[PDB]
Amino acid sequence: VACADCHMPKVQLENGKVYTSHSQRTPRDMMGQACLNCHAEWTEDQALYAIDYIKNYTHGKIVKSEYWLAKMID
Amino acid sequence: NLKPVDAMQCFDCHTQIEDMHTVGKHATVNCVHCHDATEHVETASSRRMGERPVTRMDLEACATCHTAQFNSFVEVRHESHPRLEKATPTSRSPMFDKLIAGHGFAFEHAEPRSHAFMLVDHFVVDRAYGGRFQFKNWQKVTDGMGAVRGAWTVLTDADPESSDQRRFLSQTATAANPVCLNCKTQDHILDWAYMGDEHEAAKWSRTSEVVEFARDLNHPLNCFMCHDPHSAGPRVVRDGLINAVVDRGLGTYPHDPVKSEQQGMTKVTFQRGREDFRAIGLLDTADSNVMCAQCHVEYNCNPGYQLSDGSRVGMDDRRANHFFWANVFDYKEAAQEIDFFDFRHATTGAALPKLQHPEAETFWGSVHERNGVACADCHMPKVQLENGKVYTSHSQRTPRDMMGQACLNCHAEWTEDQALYAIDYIKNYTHGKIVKSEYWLAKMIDLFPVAKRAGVSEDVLNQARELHYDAHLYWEWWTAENSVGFHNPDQARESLMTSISKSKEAVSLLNDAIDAQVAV
Amino acid sequence: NLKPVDAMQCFDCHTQIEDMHTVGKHATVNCVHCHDATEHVETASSRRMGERPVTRMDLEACATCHTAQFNSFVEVRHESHPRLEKATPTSRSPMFDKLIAGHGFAFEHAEPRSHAFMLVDHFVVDRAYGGRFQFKNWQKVTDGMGAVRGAWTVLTDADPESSDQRRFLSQTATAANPVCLNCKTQDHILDWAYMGDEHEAAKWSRTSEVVEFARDLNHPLNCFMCHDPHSAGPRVVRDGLINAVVDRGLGTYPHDPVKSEQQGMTKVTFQRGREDFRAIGLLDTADSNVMCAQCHVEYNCNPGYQLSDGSRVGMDDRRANHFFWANVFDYKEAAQEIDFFDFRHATTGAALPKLQHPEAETFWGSVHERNGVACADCHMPKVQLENGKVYTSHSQRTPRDMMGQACLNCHAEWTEDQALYAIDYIKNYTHGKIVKSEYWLAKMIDLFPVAKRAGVSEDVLNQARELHYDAHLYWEWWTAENSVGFHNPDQARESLMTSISKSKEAVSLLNDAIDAQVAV
Amino acid sequence: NLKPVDAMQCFDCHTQIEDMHTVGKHATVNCVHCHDATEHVETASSRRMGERPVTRMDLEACATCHTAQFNSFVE
Numbered sequence A: 001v002a003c004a005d006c007h008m009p010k011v012q013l014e015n016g017k018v019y020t021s022h023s024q025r026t027p028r029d030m031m032g033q034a035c036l037n038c039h040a041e042w043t044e045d046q047a048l049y050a051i052d053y054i055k056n057y058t059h060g061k062i063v064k065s066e067y068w069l070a071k072m073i074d
Numbered sequence B, C: 001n002l003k004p005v006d007a008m009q010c011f012d013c014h015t016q017i018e019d020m021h022t023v024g025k026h027a028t029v030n031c032v033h034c035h036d037a038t039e040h041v042e043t044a045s046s047r048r049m050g051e052r053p054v055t056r057m058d059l060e061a062c063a064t065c066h067t068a069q070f071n072s073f074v075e076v077r078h079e080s081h082p083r084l085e086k087a088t089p090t091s092r093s094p095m096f097d098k099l100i101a102g103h104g105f106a107f108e109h110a111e112p113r114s115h116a117f118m119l120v121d122h123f124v125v126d127r128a129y130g131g132r133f134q135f136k137n138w139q140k141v142t143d144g145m146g147a148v149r150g151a152w153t154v155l156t157d158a159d160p161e162s163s164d165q166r167r168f169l170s171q172t173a174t175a176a177n178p179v180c181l182n183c184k185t186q187d188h189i190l191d192w193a194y195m196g197d198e199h200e201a202a203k204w205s206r207t208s209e210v211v212e213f214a215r216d217l218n219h220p221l222n223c224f225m226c227h228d229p230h231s232a233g234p235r236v237v238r239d240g241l242i243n244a245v246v247d248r249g250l251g252t253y254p255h256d257p258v259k260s261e262q263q264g265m266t267k268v269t270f271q272r273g274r275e276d277f278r279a280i281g282l283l284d285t286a287d288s289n290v291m292c293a294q295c296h297v298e299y300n301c302n303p304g305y306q307l308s309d310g311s312r313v314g315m316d317d318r319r320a321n322h323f324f325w326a327n328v329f330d331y332k333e334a335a336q337e338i339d340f341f342d343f344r345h346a347t348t349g350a351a352l353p354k355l356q357h358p359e360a361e362t363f364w365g366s367v368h369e370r371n372g373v374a375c376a377d378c379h380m381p382k383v384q385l386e387n388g389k390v391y392t393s394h395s396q397r398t399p400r401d402m403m404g405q406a407c408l409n410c411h412a413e414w415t416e417d418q419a420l421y422a423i424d425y426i427k428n429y430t431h432g433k434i435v436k437s438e439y440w441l442a443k444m445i446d447l448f449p450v451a452k453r454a455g456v457s458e459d460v461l462n463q464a465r466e467l468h469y470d471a472h473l474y475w476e477w478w479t480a481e482n483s484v485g486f487h488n489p490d491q492a493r494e495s496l497m498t499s500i501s502k503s504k505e506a507v508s509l510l511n512d513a514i515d516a517q518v519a520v
Numbered sequence D: 001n002l003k004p005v006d007a008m009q010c011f012d013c014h015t016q017i018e019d020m021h022t023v024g025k026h027a028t029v030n031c032v033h034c035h036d037a038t039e040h041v042e043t044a045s046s047r048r049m050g051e052r053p054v055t056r057m058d059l060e061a062c063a064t065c066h067t068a069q070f071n072s073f074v075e
């Protein structure tokens, strides 16, 4: 998988010549193309929930790392 | 990958193309994008074609550099309900079967759908080819992209081994003829002489076996129908239109000589050997009214009969390919000028015209046309982007899908709901008058058998048949015209009241004559 | 609270039930869930019923352990517009009154609505019981749960003191008879002998006073119509279906002996004393095509007449309960086999068939049926849950409400809009041919009085009446069939063009004969 | 309106560009879309630039033939 697959995927058209979206942005705006064509087992909400599980967990450790860095700094 | 060819060498023999190509916005676009002329260049002289070069007619030839226009063109509007028969209580012409009896449209006449399908729909409609052609299956009806790629990628022919028009299912007709195809495709643009006249250099003509012609045609609404591929400048290619506007000197706006001069057309002819062969009409401006008038007009594209003596006018006659280029109130005179009618009504025996989608001739003189508004402004507007390069939508569809761009930029005083309400007021009023026109036409039509059987004289029946022509014209214009009055509400109103007036006159005439016969 | 009974003791006398119950997925489900047999067990011998045990027919008997299936079944689809008369310009058969004149459906024929209402709607439709039964008030029309709980919880009888079928309002008919009820309920499953034949052990039969029978019936579409309550295995209980498939050896798929063998039915008969009394048909597989074919077929459920001599075929005749089990092109032969027609047209005098919702016989041979797709796949699919135990939706409704499950899992190439567009292409095309078929049938019908009055011979009128039978069959199949062509678009097309062909033949015949009479 | 230039004239001194341009999917795309090299061509030698040609760096130089990519990018 490469950055473009999640961040500037091919456009899906019922009738049209396919091109590659150049709007390089979060896959949340185009989950069908960016995630769900590959993750057929998920709905959009499930895929978003999986992203958020990671981000929430990681952000929690970032905040704790900052807490401990700040305590050391002080 | 494409390799560019030496255009300058082509120009040593192609001075007309040189003059167009080098001056317009395709001056940098190499011939190899649309032609394969390698063997041609090796064998031609300025006076001998040699090997015929290939010319690409596919829309993909333009889509590589103009994807937005291509994609907006091929888009299928699923809300444009498909295969929806107009002869039903819930569509445009509830009494169409009674009124049109005797004409091939009785076999099927659906509402239009998206442009991607025009060629395939022409091929599969029940009135056209005896049911010879079908989509490969009923799923393919959705595939606008496939149809654009090529009709024969999505259709089947019931009998590839024969080329005659015949019925393959009982309730079909074989009305299609080569002229039809000129408003579905221009893949034959190099194989068809102006007007479809016989020509030594034309593979196809008005008199061709339409099934054979059909098989040679692939693409709907080629992009070059409105845009010269060499100059990129605005044009039309449809012969019947150039004929009406230029050959017949009617002008682009027959009711406005000034606008005709400002927004005119220059006929450009291309020869084969020493002989004129085909023509295009370059437009002074990018005038969509005239571009759309290549097809959205009332026309002959069919055999008919002469009003004068009733004799057959066959496909060989120039009149079989004709743009009347006349509003509804000038049409009867325009038909008399070429001495032509379409069919005899099956019940009344009246000589009748068959009207087809006269959007262009209806739009003339209307408030929007008089204000310089054109088809594209309401049906293929510029796209509005918060951030982006503007282009012109090619999804030619009802303004209801893009009211901000199609109406409300101009009508700042209205909300979308208000503008829709104004549209619906016109269509509702017009449709009620259509329905009343049909009620009265049907009442007249039903009196004909009673009258004939009661012994009413031929003279009285002929008087009623003359009234039928008028009643019919002044009604059918509006079921044929796609805006349900919107394009010219006052004209529709005046015409439909005229229809009803004529029908009522005929009803009175017949009832009185029947009553007089009974009283004897 | 329920107390379990000794099933083993029941089995000392009920060996058929033992063989079903102990082997299937209801082996642990105690009899007390659906029977009260206390006094029965105290009084019975293996050869004498003794006190009749109670058998619960209410759907709640299943809803305690199968709430999801029950709840999805009872759900009211409010978008299935209620009491919507088909004989109107905006519904299925705009000219139905003219075409069906002479038949009880002229008094009312609404579009179907949700299954919860089938029994109450049968009772209150204007054609059924002379308007005897009504909802208690006009609010109760919404109450699907109430109707399922019991028809008589939501209906009133205008005259509980009489049991005869009569008109209570002028524009009603009394077409209901006991056979009807077999496609509304099976509450009478233990009180009705196979086919509704007279039987000493049957309280009800084809010849019963239908008003008395009606009062004894409560529940729509009992869950056990498709599921044996003892084995829980798939079955049908409808006698006319078992008769067609098994007794008449037509098979579950008359056009496919292989599929008939793989997906077959085993008739199981239950006796009363020494005598066969009732039967069920166990299915080899959970084949919804055959389960739904218990009711969604063309049938006799009514008296009629013999084609041969015109004599009355009354409810006492087995032919009054008949599944033709024939596609539209085999129907005329199937009706000739039993020497039967339904009514004489009020205007033409033609002997005519009355067709009813032949979804099953239409579906045969269609592309989906040939691919092993079945009613349930499009009309009661498995539910898709992000997290949950899958079950089968029992809300038997249009796939438009659940396109992901009903269509798009299979048709991965389509969006919902594309799939809807494909449906609409078929229904639009089919409906336009229905409307044209009606136009031509109506034109023929209107010629009959003119012809009769003009002195056209009985021989010519009879020729036209024979054509009327065909024109009618090949049209009415498609107004009766609920998919508007979707279930078999090519068949619909072929049939409707045949209808129009026949009507046109009759119109020509009559106009020529009328014209010849006038010319004399 | 753009007038094409003779790329062969450029290629005589620009072998690397020739090898890239003639082979790829821009083989038909004339230099004038992105360069104004008229005075450069009159003044360059095989090793000295002469007058510096203009090279368009704006994204609109690609947007006329690739509107969809450009518009999705700028959104």
Ligand code: HEC
Pocket: A001, A002, A003, A004, A005, A006, A007, A025, A026, A027, A028, A051, A055
């Ligand atoms: C398998 C899919 C996937 C791949 C491949 C991927 N990304 Fe991401 N990226 C994500 C997701 C999910 C997020 C979080 C977006 C959100 O929460 O809205 C993200 C976030 C980002 C963001 C921040 C987006 C914003 O709006 O905040 C950037 C920048 C980014 N990725 C760049 C890249 C780069 C560069 C690559 C390739 C090296 C890459 N991504 C590959 C899925 C992917």
Ligand code: HEC
Pocket: A004, A018, A019, A020, A021, A022, D059, D062, D063, D066, D069, D070, D071, D073
């Ligand atoms: C960050 C790198 C990047 C930039 C900058 C970029 N693109 Fe692309 N472009 C891509 C990728 C990735 C693809 C898809 C390649 C593939 O998957 O085959 C692509 C594909 C294309 C294509 C091929 C057709 C298609 O859509 O797949 C065109 C034409 C194109 N880009 C034009 C442009 C234009 C015009 C711009 C400036 C508006 C631009 N690109 C800027 C990365 C880029």
Ligand code: HEC
Pocket: B005, B006, B007, B009, B010, B011, B012, B013, B014, B031, B035, B037, B038, B040, B041, B044, B045, B046, B047, B048, B049, B050, B052, B053, B054, B055, B190, B271, B272, B273, B274
């Ligand atoms: C030696 C002179 C000459 C050369 C050079 C030349 N052509 Fe032609 N071309 C002709 C002639 C002659 C015809 C036929 C005109 C006629 O029918 O009278 C023709 C016809 C055509 C046609 C129309 C064929 C048809 O289907 O009717 C096309 C397209 C065309 N040329 C393209 C090109 C291209 C592109 C080049 C450069 C790669 C080229 N020609 C170079 C002489 C030439």
Ligand code: HEC
Pocket: B025, B026, B029, B030, B033, B034, B061, B062, B063, B064, B065, B066, B223, B224, B227, B228, B229, B231, B232, B233, D028, D064, D065
């Ligand atoms: C190799 C790329 C390419 C091809 C292929 C191509 N065009 Fe163009 N087209 C251009 C360019 C570049 C312009 C000029 C853009 C500008 O200057 O705004 C242009 C301009 C146009 C214009 C605007 C002309 C004007 O005067 O405003 C139209 C219309 C057009 N092309 C139509 C077409 C048609 C129709 C086809 C297919 C027959 C086609 N093009 C094929 C590149 C191409």
Ligand code: HEC
Pocket: B077, B080, B111, B112, B113, B114, B115, B116, B117, B118, B119, B121, B122, B182, B183, B184, B185, B221, B225, B288, B291, B292, B293, B294, B295, B296, B375, B376, B379, B380, B396, B397, B398
């Ligand atoms: C080559 C002939 C031709 C040209 C030029 C043409 N049309 Fe059409 N148009 C058709 C045909 C044919 C259909 C019906 C297509 C079908 O039913 O498959 C149609 C359908 C339509 C529709 C209905 C689309 C829908 O969603 O149902 C509209 C709106 C329309 N045309 C507007 C226009 C406009 C505006 C123009 C000028 C920009 C134009 N047309 C130019 C032939 C043409």
Ligand code: HEC
Pocket: B108, B109, B110, B111, B112, B113, B121, B122, B123, B125, B127, B128, B175, B176, B177, B179, B180, B181, B182, B183, B294, B295, B296, B297, B298, B299, B300, B301, B302, B356, B357, B480, B482
């Ligand atoms: C003057 C151009 C023109 C001619 C020639 C032409 N059409 Fe059309 N046709 C149109 C336009 C515009 C529409 C869309 C508007 C409408 O349907 O009213 C259309 C729509 C159609 C449709 C789709 C709607 C329907 O009626 O079912 C079919 C099919 C069709 N034409 C078949 C034919 C046949 C067959 C012929 C030759 C007998 C023919 N056309 C000739 C312009 C033309």
Ligand code: HEC
Pocket: B059, B062, B063, B066, B069, B070, B071, B073, B221, B222, B223, B224, B225, B226, B227, B286, B287, B288, B291, B292, B376, B390, B391, B392, B393, B394
């Ligand atoms: C029925 C006539 C018609 C057809 C066919 C047609 N166009 Fe256009 N085209 C127009 C009109 C009208 C405009 C806007 C002209 C104006 O207002 O300046 C336009 C504008 C354009 C432009 C100029 C840039 C823009 O978007 O304004 C291009 C490029 C173009 N069209 C490409 C195409 C392509 C590619 C096709 C085939 C998919 C096509 N056209 C088919 C009528 C047509």
Ligand code: HEC
Pocket: B366, B367, B368, B371, B373, B377, B378, B399, B405, B406, B407, B408, B410, B411, B419, B420, B422, B423, B486, B487, B488, B489, B490
């Ligand atoms: C380019 C500007 C423009 C466009 C776009 C436009 N209008 Fe108009 N419209 C006008 C003007 C100017 C008038 C005449 C105003 C006056 O004379 O008071 C008018 C008149 C009308 C009328 C009176 C119509 C008649 O024929 O008598 C109606 C209704 C109307 N517009 C609705 C609409 C609708 C709905 C749309 C979108 C489909 C639309 N207009 C798009 C400018 C526009």
Ligand code: HEC
Pocket: C005, C006, C007, C009, C010, C011, C012, C013, C014, C031, C035, C037, C038, C040, C041, C044, C045, C046, C047, C048, C049, C050, C052, C053, C054, C055, C190, C271, C272, C273, C274
């Ligand atoms: C002593 C033998 C015997 C016993 C034990 C027995 N049954 Fe029966 N049952 C019969 C007979 C005999 C009939 C009538 C069969 C016939 O009509 O010939 C009958 C009929 C029935 C019926 C159908 C009644 C109808 O409406 O037609 C049901 C239900 C039933 N039994 C349930 C049960 C249950 C449950 C049990 C155990 C609690 C049970 N029986 C135990 C002998 C027995």
Ligand code: HEC
Pocket: C025, C026, C029, C030, C033, C034, C061, C062, C063, C064, C065, C066, C223, C224, C227, C228, C229, C231, C232, C233
């Ligand atoms: C006391 C609980 C209970 C009652 C009451 C009940 N069932 Fe069941 N049913 C079950 C159980 C337990 C299963 C087996 C579940 C499993 O194994 O997947 C089952 C299975 C089924 C099945 C699936 C059978 C198969 O072979 O796949 C059907 C169909 C069914 N029941 C129908 C009904 C019907 C209809 C009724 C009302 C006549 C009913 N059940 C009443 C408990 C009950």
Ligand code: HEC
Pocket: C108, C109, C110, C111, C112, C113, C121, C122, C123, C125, C127, C128, C175, C176, C177, C179, C180, C181, C182, C183, C294, C295, C296, C297, C298, C299, C300, C301, C302, C356, C357, C480, C482
């Ligand atoms: C072979 C099974 C079967 C028979 C027997 C049967 N019906 Fe129906 N009935 C159905 C089906 C299936 C529907 C839903 C489909 C439809 O309406 O087309 C239905 C629908 C109805 C409806 C609701 C729609 C309407 O027509 O108003 C009524 C009322 C009705 N039936 C009454 C009756 C009457 C009265 C009889 C006996 C004269 C009868 N049914 C016999 C299967 C049957």
Ligand code: HEC
Pocket: C059, C062, C063, C066, C069, C070, C071, C073, C221, C222, C223, C224, C225, C226, C227, C286, C287, C288, C291, C292, C376, C390, C391, C392, C393, C394
């Ligand atoms: C018209 C026939 C029919 C009726 C009546 C019917 N079902 Fe079903 N039932 C089915 C079909 C079809 C299935 C799915 C069988 C399969 O595909 O395996 C099913 C499956 C089931 C299952 C198995 C679990 C599941 O959901 O797949 C149960 C339990 C069940 N039904 C209960 C009931 C209940 C309770 C009722 C009464 C509310 C009922 N059924 C009425 C046709 C019917």
Ligand code: HEC
Pocket: B137, B138, B139, C366, C367, C368, C371, C373, C377, C378, C399, C405, C406, C407, C408, C410, C411, C419, C420, C422, C423, C486, C487, C488, C489, C490
């Ligand atoms: C269980 C899979 C499945 C289901 C569910 C399904 N289809 Fe199909 N459908 C098929 C297959 C397989 C074909 C035949 C494909 C082929 O032969 O190319 C087909 C054919 C069709 C056709 C051609 C129809 C004909 O009778 O000629 C249409 C239209 C269609 N499907 C639409 C739908 C719609 C709409 C739905 C949902 C109501 C649906 N399908 C549900 C598998 C399915």
Ligand code: HEC
Pocket: B064, B065, D025, D026, D029, D030, D033, D061, D062, D063, D064, D065, D066
């Ligand atoms: C005069 C028109 C034109 C110009 C200007 C243009 N291109 Fe292209 N581009 C093309 C054509 C034609 C193709 C080939 C399309 C095809 O064969 O699919 C192409 C192909 C591409 C591709 C796909 C290449 C591949 O190997 O798949 C990319 C990426 C691309 N161009 C980027 C750009 C960039 C970035 C610019 C601006 C620096 C640009 N183009 C300017 C016409 C143009």
Ligand SMILES: O=N[O-]
Pocket: B356, B357
């Ligand atoms: O039927 N095409 O006007």
Ligand SMILES: O=N[O-]
Pocket: C356, C357
């Ligand atoms: O009217 N029930 O088929």
